[PDB]
Design an enzyme around this catalytic site. Sequence first.
Site, PDB file in Angstrom:
ATOM      1  N   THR A 119      18.938  57.424  80.381  1.00  0.00           N
ATOM      2  CA  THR A 119      19.080  58.972  80.192  1.00  0.00           C
ATOM      3  C   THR A 119      19.352  58.634  78.528  1.00  0.00           C
ATOM      4  OG1 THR A 119      20.650  59.512  81.744  1.00  0.00           O
ATOM      5  CG2 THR A 119      20.329  60.904  80.442  1.00  0.00           C
ATOM      6  N   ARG A 151      18.876  60.452  95.126  1.00  0.00           N
ATOM      7  CA  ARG A 151      19.916  60.893  94.318  1.00  0.00           C
ATOM      8  C   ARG A 151      19.838  61.748  93.099  1.00  0.00           C
ATOM      9  NH1 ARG A 151      21.180  59.664  88.428  1.00  0.00           N
ATOM     10  NH2 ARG A 151      23.677  58.494  88.929  1.00  0.00           N
ATOM     11  N   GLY A 173      22.097  62.729  89.506  1.00  0.00           N
ATOM     12  CA  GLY A 173      23.131  62.899  88.497  1.00  0.00           C
ATOM     13  C   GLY A 173      22.983  64.044  88.096  1.00  0.00           C
ATOM     14  N   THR A 211      25.779  61.449  78.420  1.00  0.00           N
ATOM     15  CA  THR A 211      24.890  60.282  79.608  1.00  0.00           C
ATOM     16  C   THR A 211      26.276  59.156  79.913  1.00  0.00           C
ATOM     17  OG1 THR A 211      23.892  58.319  78.883  1.00  0.00           O
ATOM     18  CG2 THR A 211      24.940  59.326  76.705  1.00  0.00           C
TER      19      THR A 211
END
EC number: 3.4.19.5
Lengths: 135, 135, 156, 156
Positions: A1, A29, A31, A52
Amino acid sequence: TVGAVALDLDGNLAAATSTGGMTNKLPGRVGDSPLVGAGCYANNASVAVSCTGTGEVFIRALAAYDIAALMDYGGLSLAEACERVVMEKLPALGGSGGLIAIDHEGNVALPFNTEGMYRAWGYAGDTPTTGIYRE
Amino acid sequence: TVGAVALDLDGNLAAATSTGGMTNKLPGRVGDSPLVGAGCYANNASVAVSCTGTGEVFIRALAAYDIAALMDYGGLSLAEACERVVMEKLPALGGSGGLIAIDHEGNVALPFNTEGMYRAWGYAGDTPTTGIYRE
Amino acid sequence: GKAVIAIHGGAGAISRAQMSLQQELRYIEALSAIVETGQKMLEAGESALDVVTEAVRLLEECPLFNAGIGAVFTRDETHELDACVMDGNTLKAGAVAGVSHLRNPVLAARLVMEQSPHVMMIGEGAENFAFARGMERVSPEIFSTSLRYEQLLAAR
Amino acid sequence: GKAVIAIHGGAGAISRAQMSLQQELRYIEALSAIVETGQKMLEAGESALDVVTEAVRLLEECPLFNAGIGAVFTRDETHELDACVMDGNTLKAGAVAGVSHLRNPVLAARLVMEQSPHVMMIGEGAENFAFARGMERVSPEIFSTSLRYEQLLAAR
Ligand SMILES: [Cl-]
Ligand SMILES: [Cl-]
Ligand SMILES: [Cl-]
Ligand SMILES: [Cl-]
Ligand SMILES: [Cl-]
Ligand SMILES: [Cl-]
Ligand SMILES: [Cl-]
Ligand SMILES: [Cl-]
Ligand SMILES: [Cl-]
Ligand code: NA
Ligand code: NA
């Protein structure tokens, strides 16, 4: 990230976050990175934040917006809000990571609870500061 | 869009939201419904919330979590927080809709700024109430 | 004690001038039946998590409401469904977006929360995850209703 | 008030004992170059939104950082990328999730914000939305690096 936050000469704040996710994630998925208030948030009334870490916890804790709300409603400084979210609340939920944040007055914070966080910051017309490990 | 919030006999709060989106929706668009803190949020320490409305604004304003933050950090009552979010902040951004909410003390609120919201609620052991329009 | 449930079937799609009393009564009856089920569960000591899951599952099943069966149509005459569930006791959450082959998105969302290390799953990945965990695949047309299809034709 | 920028390239287990100074300096140099670009833009009067978009684009382009080129691998040896941008002045935001055929997710996110009424687009729909507006389609292997692949192989 990766991510960036900024305050411009007109006093506007902005934030951006981008990622490939976490190694070996299940396909599909998602995040915190693409979720407003989780991995990315900006509001001139308070702060710009990019996060992050372990995405799931940053979603559950709405980390980016939580910084904003602690400052706006709670009257906490950027530093205090960052300490609370990154060093107290996220660990309590089993979250690891950090964030970068700039408030509307130009205060900057780069909190993290991990071994390192690749990061840098600089005021316009000044030399920047970089970092990897704990201060 | 549909949703439910509840406080159980053990003092636990929970929330759920589900939707089909919008008629003629651009494929791949995501509204607030599946996004934690936008269309659905629950925390034993504050509130359970499920929203319905103009998705984009509920995302930008993190409506569900904002109810929680206003109570937690701002000290607002559930009623005060719902008024602030649904009758002031959401319309200021061009949003319309409403939400249902239950706090950890068992207060319940079903605010909406639209002509109607299909809704119902009931305390355990009591007769339930339903509604469609305002009043 | 303080136990209580609230449910909603959407805000904003309601116009008194364009509705009849019998239509209104059908909605009242639908809402009443679902809230009564939730209340009974709460009275019996079932968890808030199970209560909101069942209430939303019922709202999904109910063709009157835009979730699950009775979902609106996208631009491409398809259905894209989304759902979220959150447990206030553990602060865990589960969510799916853009699913078309799962009958009950709220149950898929709960599956993500309980049987994955993730909070949010989307599209075919979400579907495959659910199927692997034993959730049934449904034909995408199961959600379709003439009421909503006519609304699409009108919207066009 | 002074204009200012901060950037990050991810938080995690970064072990000094396993690194050399020259290895560290490659990250330091990369971070410095990007932050300096942002500083110059700010000094020149560019908007915060343009500064964060460009800084993140540069972080995507770098293979050292897990976004864009250099993205980590999923369980299936694929790349699925996500990004968000938010404008603190208007409170508008744009985001994409689960994209594999867009070189710079942050630019796609910005496109969502500026050329649609929406905030979040996912998967194929996000990609089609971007392609229809001039953004080029890429093959996901452009993001692959041996470093991240070995990390997947090791994670197995
Ligand atoms: Cl406020
Ligand atoms: Cl209305
Ligand atoms: Cl009649
Ligand atoms: Cl079935
Ligand atoms: Cl039908
Ligand atoms: Cl670490
Ligand atoms: Cl050296
Ligand atoms: Cl390209
Ligand atoms: Cl390579
Ligand atoms: Na339904
Ligand atoms: Na990169």
